Structure 1
């Protein structure tokens, strides 16, 4: 898994894994490449 700068991959105990970005301020269930 490539980790891009500004992104945090955070898995909550409910089984909620959201990829969030502080750069553009966006979150997605998909794995970001860039």
Structure 2
């Protein structure tokens, strides 16, 4: 896993290398490193 993501944020991949951040607590799909 990757440290730095807030409580609720999760990182995933689109299988094709692309790493996106999916927050389950806020139901967000973010292509960006979460700052909060």
Q: TM-score, normalised by structure 2?
A: 0.67
Aligned length: 34
RMSD: 1.5
Q: Provide, for residues 1-34 of structure 1, a one-character-per-residue CA deviation record: whole Å limited to 9, x for no partner.
A: 5121111111343112110011110111111111
Instruction: Please point out which of 22, 25, 28 is paired with 1:23.
Output: 25
Show structure 1 runs of 4+ deviating over 4 A: none
Q: TM-score, normalised by structure 1?
A: 0.68
